[PDB]
Amino acid sequence: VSQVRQNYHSDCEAAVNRMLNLELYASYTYSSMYAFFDRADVALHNVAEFFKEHSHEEREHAEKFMKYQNKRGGRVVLQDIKKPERDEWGNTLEAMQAALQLEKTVNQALLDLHKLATDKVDPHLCDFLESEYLEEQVKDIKRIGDFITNLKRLGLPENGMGEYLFDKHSVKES
Amino acid sequence: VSQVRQNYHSDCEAAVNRMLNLELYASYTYSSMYAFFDRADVALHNVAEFFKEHSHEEREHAEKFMKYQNKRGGRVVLQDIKKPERDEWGNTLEAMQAALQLEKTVNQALLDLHKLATDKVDPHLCDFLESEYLEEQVKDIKRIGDFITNLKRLGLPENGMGEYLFDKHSVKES
Amino acid sequence: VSQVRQNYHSDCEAAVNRMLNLELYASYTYSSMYAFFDRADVALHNVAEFFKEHSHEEREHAEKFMKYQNKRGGRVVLQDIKKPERDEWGNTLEAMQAALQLEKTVNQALLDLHKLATDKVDPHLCDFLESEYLEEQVKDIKRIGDFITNLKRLGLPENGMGEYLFDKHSVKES
Amino acid sequence: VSQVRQNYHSDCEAAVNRMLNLELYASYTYSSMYAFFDRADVALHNVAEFFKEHSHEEREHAEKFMKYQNKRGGRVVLQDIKKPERDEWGNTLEAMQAALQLEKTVNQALLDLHKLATDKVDPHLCDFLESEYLEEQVKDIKRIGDFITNLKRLGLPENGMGEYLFDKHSVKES
Ligand SMILES: [Cl-]
Ligand SMILES: [Cl-]
Ligand SMILES: [Cl-]
Ligand SMILES: [Cl-]
Ligand SMILES: [Cl-]
Ligand SMILES: [Cl-]
Ligand SMILES: [Cl-]
Ligand SMILES: [Cl-]
Ligand SMILES: [Cl-]
Ligand SMILES: [Cl-]
Ligand SMILES: [Cl-]
Ligand SMILES: [Cl-]
Ligand SMILES: [Cl-]
Ligand SMILES: [Cl-]
Ligand SMILES: [Cl-]
Ligand SMILES: [Cl-]
Ligand SMILES: [Cl-]
Ligand SMILES: [Cl-]
Ligand SMILES: [Cl-]
Ligand SMILES: [Cl-]
Ligand SMILES: [Cl-]
Ligand SMILES: [Cl-]
Ligand SMILES: [Cl-]
Ligand SMILES: [Cl-]
Ligand SMILES: [Cl-]
Ligand SMILES: [Cl-]
Ligand SMILES: [Cl-]
Ligand SMILES: [Cl-]
Ligand SMILES: [Cl-]
Ligand SMILES: [Cl-]
Ligand SMILES: [Mg+2]
Ligand SMILES: [Mg+2]
Ligand SMILES: [Mg+2]
Ligand SMILES: [Mg+2]
Ligand SMILES: [Mg+2]
Ligand SMILES: [Mg+2]
Ligand SMILES: [Mg+2]
Ligand SMILES: [Mg+2]
Ligand SMILES: [Mg+2]
Ligand SMILES: [Mg+2]
Ligand SMILES: [Mg+2]
Ligand SMILES: [Mg+2]
Ligand SMILES: [Mg+2]
Ligand SMILES: [Mg+2]
Ligand SMILES: [Mg+2]
Ligand SMILES: [Mg+2]
Ligand SMILES: [Mg+2]
Ligand SMILES: [Mg+2]
Ligand SMILES: [Mg+2]
Ligand SMILES: [Mg+2]
Ligand SMILES: [Mg+2]
Ligand SMILES: [Mg+2]
Ligand SMILES: [Mg+2]
Ligand SMILES: [Mg+2]
C-alpha cells in the first residue's frame, strides 16, 4: 500500500472513484442544459448561464474528490463520462425538474458514501462529506425547489410571458 | 431549419459536435495526468498543475465549440466522454510524449475540419478555426516539444534528479 | 492604374462599391425603424434606440468599405441609396423579422464577395471580410434570432403587455 | 464534579490528557530534528527550520487540548515528556521517514480518541477532533510522503547533491 495510507478502506476508495464519476456526469448534464437554453430557438440566457455555473461547480467537486483520493493514498481510477439522458430539455420547468432529480441523486450517493464511511469507521471521510458536500447540496436542492414553485406560479409550461419573467428576475443577470 | 442558419452545412455541424467531444476527451486525459503527478508516490506538483491548467484550457475550447454551434444554428449533440487510454502515466517524459501525441491528434482533427469547411465554402468556420484554434495549437505543440527535448537532456527516464529539476525550473511554480 | 494597386481585380473593386451601397441601404432601413418606434403612437423607445444604434453601425461599415477601396487603389463610386421597403414597421416582431432578413441579405452579399475574392486569389480581401465583417454578422443574426424567439414567447403580435416587457428587459435601457 | 461538566466521560478526560502528552512528545522530537539539521556538520538550514516550525505547531496543538480539557470541566494532568527515540537523525530521508511514522502515530491516537468519543456518545469531542485535528493530520502526512518520494528520486541517502537540492527547493526558504 501507499506510505501515506491510514484507516482508508478499499471499499471507500472505490466509492470515492464512483462519486468522482457521478460529479463529472452531473457537470456534463448541466452543460447540456446550458447549451439548450443558449439556442436561438430557446434563448433564455440567464437560465443558460445558471446551468453553466452549476456545471463548473460540479466539475470542481469532482476535482476535490480526486485531490481527496490522493491525500488518503488511494488511486484515482477514471471511467467514461456518460452523456446526459436527454438531448433537449423542453423548457425551464422541465429542466429545473431534471436538475432537482439530479441533485437528489447526487445527494443520495453522498449519503450512501457517508454510511459506508461510518461503517468502516472513517471519521476523516465523514468530516469531508459533511464539511464540503452535504450542506451545499441541501442549499442547491432548496434553491431549485424554490425555482420550481415559482415556475409553476408563473404558469409554466404554457405561459411564455411567465417563463420570460423568471429568466429576468429569478436567476442572476448574466 | 433554424431561422439563424445560413451557409452552414450539415456535415460541418456534425464535425463540430465531434470536435467538441474530442476537446472534452483531451481535457479528461489531462485531468488524469494531473491526478497522477499529484500522487504521494509521484509528487511532481508543478508538472501536475501544468496538466490541470491544460485540462481547464481544453474544456474551455469545448465550450467555445458549443457556443459556435448555437451561433450558426446547428444543434449541440453530446456523446460519452471516453476515459483516457492509460490509468497511470509512468513519469514526466512519458506523460509529455503522450501530451504531444494528443495535441497532434487534436491538431489533425482541427485541420480536417478546416478542409471540410473549405470544401463546403464556409469562410466563417475557416476564420473561427484559424483565429481561435490553429495558432494556439502550434504554440502548445512547440512548448511540449521543447519540454521533451529538455527532459531527454536531463536524462529521463533514469535520472530522478533531472526529473526533479525539470519540475522546479521548466514549468511554472504552482 | 493607381501606383498603390496590386493584386486587386476590377470585379472586386466593383463588388466593394456595391457592398458600400448595400451597407448604406441597410443603415437607412434601420433609421426608418428607429423613426417608427420613436412615434408617439408606437412609443417603444428602447427598441427605437436599438435600431438607431444599428443604423450607425451599418454606416460605419460603409465607411470602412470606402477606406478599403482607397487603400487597395480602387475608386469609390457612389449610387443612390434606395429608400426602405416599408414606411411603417407594424410592431417589434415584424420589425425584428425584417431586421433578420436584412442581416441575412447583407451576410449573403458578404459571402458572395468572399467567393469572388477567393476566385480572384485576393487573400487581403478575404482577410478583411473574415476579420471585420463575417463574425460580427453571425453575432447580429444570432441576437435578432434570440429576440424573435422571445417576442413569440411574449405573445406578439397580440400581447401588448409582452411587447412592453420586451422593450424594458431585452434591449438595453436608453 | 465541575459545574460546567456535561456529557464528559472520565475515560475521555483521561485520553485527552494522554493526547496532550503525545503532542508534547511529538513537538520535542521535532525540536531534536531541528537541532540536528542546524549542526555545522549537517547544515541543512531549510530542513532544520521546517522541523522547528512543526515543533511549534505540535506545541500549539498540545495547548489546544489543555484549553479543551478545561472547557469541558475535566482536569489537566501532566506527565513527563519523554526524550526523543534518537539523538541524531542520520540525514533528511531518515528524518522524514521518522516524521512520517510520528505523524501516523499521532493520527492513530487521534482516531482512537474519536472511537472512544463515539462509544461514549460525545459529539462535541468528535467535532473537535474532526474540525481541529484529523484533516490537518492528513495534510501533514501527505506532505511528508511527497517529500520522501522526492528524496528517493534525488538519490538519498547516497546523493549529497540531491540532498542539497531538496533543501533549496522542496522546503520553504528560511
Ligand atoms: Cl494503497
Ligand atoms: Cl489503510
Ligand atoms: Cl481495505
Ligand atoms: Cl468534463
Ligand atoms: Cl431527448
Ligand atoms: Cl457543504
Ligand atoms: Cl426563489
Ligand atoms: Cl397561466
Ligand atoms: Cl437547422
Ligand atoms: Cl444553411
Ligand atoms: Cl446541409
Ligand atoms: Cl495504464
Ligand atoms: Cl489560435
Ligand atoms: Cl523549454
Ligand atoms: Cl543521465
Ligand atoms: Cl487603378
Ligand atoms: Cl491590380
Ligand atoms: Cl482587373
Ligand atoms: Cl446616410
Ligand atoms: Cl409601408
Ligand atoms: Cl467580424
Ligand atoms: Cl435574448
Ligand atoms: Cl399571449
Ligand atoms: Cl469534574
Ligand atoms: Cl459529565
Ligand atoms: Cl464518567
Ligand atoms: Cl541515536
Ligand atoms: Cl483539521
Ligand atoms: Cl513535493
Ligand atoms: Cl543517485
Ligand atoms: Mg481496492
Ligand atoms: Mg450510452
Ligand atoms: Mg459546513
Ligand atoms: Mg452548491
Ligand atoms: Mg453539490
Ligand atoms: Mg417586470
Ligand atoms: Mg445534419
Ligand atoms: Mg471503454
Ligand atoms: Mg482563408
Ligand atoms: Mg491569430
Ligand atoms: Mg493553448
Ligand atoms: Mg488547443
Ligand atoms: Mg473596373
Ligand atoms: Mg424607388
Ligand atoms: Mg481555397
Ligand atoms: Mg475575428
Ligand atoms: Mg455587429
Ligand atoms: Mg454587419
Ligand atoms: Mg476520571
Ligand atoms: Mg527514558
Ligand atoms: Mg463536522
Ligand atoms: Mg475542517
Ligand atoms: Mg498541520
Ligand atoms: Mg497534527
CSV table of N, CA and C in Angstrom, one decimal, chain A residues 44 91-93 150-166, chain C residues 152-155 159 161-162 165:
chain,number,residue,atom,x,y,z
A,44,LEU,N,-33.0,31.7,-23.5
A,44,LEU,CA,-33.2,32.2,-22.1
A,44,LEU,C,-31.8,32.2,-21.5
A,91,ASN,N,-38.1,23.0,-21.6
A,91,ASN,CA,-38.4,24.4,-21.1
A,91,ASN,C,-37.8,24.5,-19.7
A,92,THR,N,-37.9,25.7,-19.2
A,92,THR,CA,-37.2,26.0,-17.9
A,92,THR,C,-37.8,25.0,-16.8
A,93,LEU,N,-39.1,24.8,-16.8
A,93,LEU,CA,-39.7,23.9,-15.8
A,93,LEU,C,-39.1,22.5,-15.9
A,150,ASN,N,-41.9,28.7,-8.2
A,150,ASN,CA,-42.1,30.0,-8.9
A,150,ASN,C,-42.4,29.8,-10.4
A,151,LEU,N,-41.8,28.8,-11.0
A,151,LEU,CA,-42.2,28.5,-12.4
A,151,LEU,C,-43.6,28.0,-12.5
A,152,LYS,N,-44.1,27.2,-11.6
A,152,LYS,CA,-45.5,26.8,-11.6
A,152,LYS,C,-46.4,27.9,-11.4
A,153,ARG,N,-46.1,28.8,-10.4
A,153,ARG,CA,-46.8,30.0,-10.1
A,153,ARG,C,-46.9,30.9,-11.4
A,154,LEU,N,-45.8,30.9,-12.2
A,154,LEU,CA,-45.8,31.8,-13.4
A,154,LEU,C,-46.5,31.1,-14.6
A,155,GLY,N,-47.0,29.9,-14.3
A,155,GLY,CA,-47.9,29.3,-15.4
A,155,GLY,C,-47.2,28.4,-16.4
A,156,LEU,N,-46.0,28.0,-16.0
A,156,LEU,CA,-45.3,27.1,-16.9
A,156,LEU,C,-46.0,25.7,-16.9
A,157,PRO,N,-46.0,25.0,-18.0
A,157,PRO,CA,-45.2,25.4,-19.2
A,157,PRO,C,-45.9,26.3,-20.2
A,158,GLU,N,-47.2,26.5,-20.1
A,158,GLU,CA,-47.9,27.2,-21.1
A,158,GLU,C,-47.6,28.7,-21.2
A,159,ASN,N,-47.3,29.3,-20.1
A,159,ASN,CA,-47.2,30.7,-20.1
A,159,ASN,C,-45.9,31.3,-20.4
A,160,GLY,N,-45.7,31.6,-21.7
A,160,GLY,CA,-44.4,32.1,-22.1
A,160,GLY,C,-43.9,33.4,-21.4
A,161,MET,N,-44.9,34.3,-21.2
A,161,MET,CA,-44.5,35.5,-20.5
A,161,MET,C,-44.0,35.2,-19.1
A,162,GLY,N,-44.5,34.2,-18.5
A,162,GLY,CA,-44.1,33.8,-17.2
A,162,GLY,C,-42.7,33.2,-17.2
A,163,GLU,N,-42.4,32.5,-18.3
A,163,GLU,CA,-41.0,31.9,-18.5
A,163,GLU,C,-40.0,33.0,-18.7
A,164,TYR,N,-40.4,34.0,-19.6
A,164,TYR,CA,-39.6,35.2,-19.8
A,164,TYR,C,-39.3,35.9,-18.5
A,165,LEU,N,-40.3,36.1,-17.7
A,165,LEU,CA,-40.1,36.9,-16.5
A,165,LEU,C,-39.2,36.1,-15.5
A,166,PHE,N,-39.3,34.8,-15.4
A,166,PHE,CA,-38.4,34.1,-14.5
A,166,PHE,C,-37.0,34.3,-14.8
C,152,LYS,N,-42.0,36.0,-29.7
C,152,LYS,CA,-43.0,35.0,-29.9
C,152,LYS,C,-43.5,34.4,-28.6
C,153,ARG,N,-42.5,34.1,-27.7
C,153,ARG,CA,-42.8,33.7,-26.3
C,153,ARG,C,-43.7,34.6,-25.6
C,154,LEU,N,-43.5,35.9,-25.8
C,154,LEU,CA,-44.2,37.0,-25.1
C,154,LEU,C,-45.6,37.3,-25.7
C,155,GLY,N,-45.9,36.5,-26.8
C,155,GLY,CA,-47.3,36.5,-27.3
C,155,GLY,C,-47.5,37.6,-28.4
C,159,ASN,N,-50.1,40.3,-27.9
C,159,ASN,CA,-49.9,40.6,-26.5
C,159,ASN,C,-49.1,41.9,-26.2
C,161,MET,N,-48.8,43.7,-23.5
C,161,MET,CA,-48.0,43.7,-22.3
C,161,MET,C,-46.7,43.0,-22.6
C,162,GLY,N,-46.7,41.9,-23.4
C,162,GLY,CA,-45.5,41.3,-23.7
C,162,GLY,C,-44.5,42.1,-24.6
C,165,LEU,N,-42.9,44.6,-22.2
C,165,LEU,CA,-41.9,44.0,-21.3
C,165,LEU,C,-40.6,43.7,-22.1
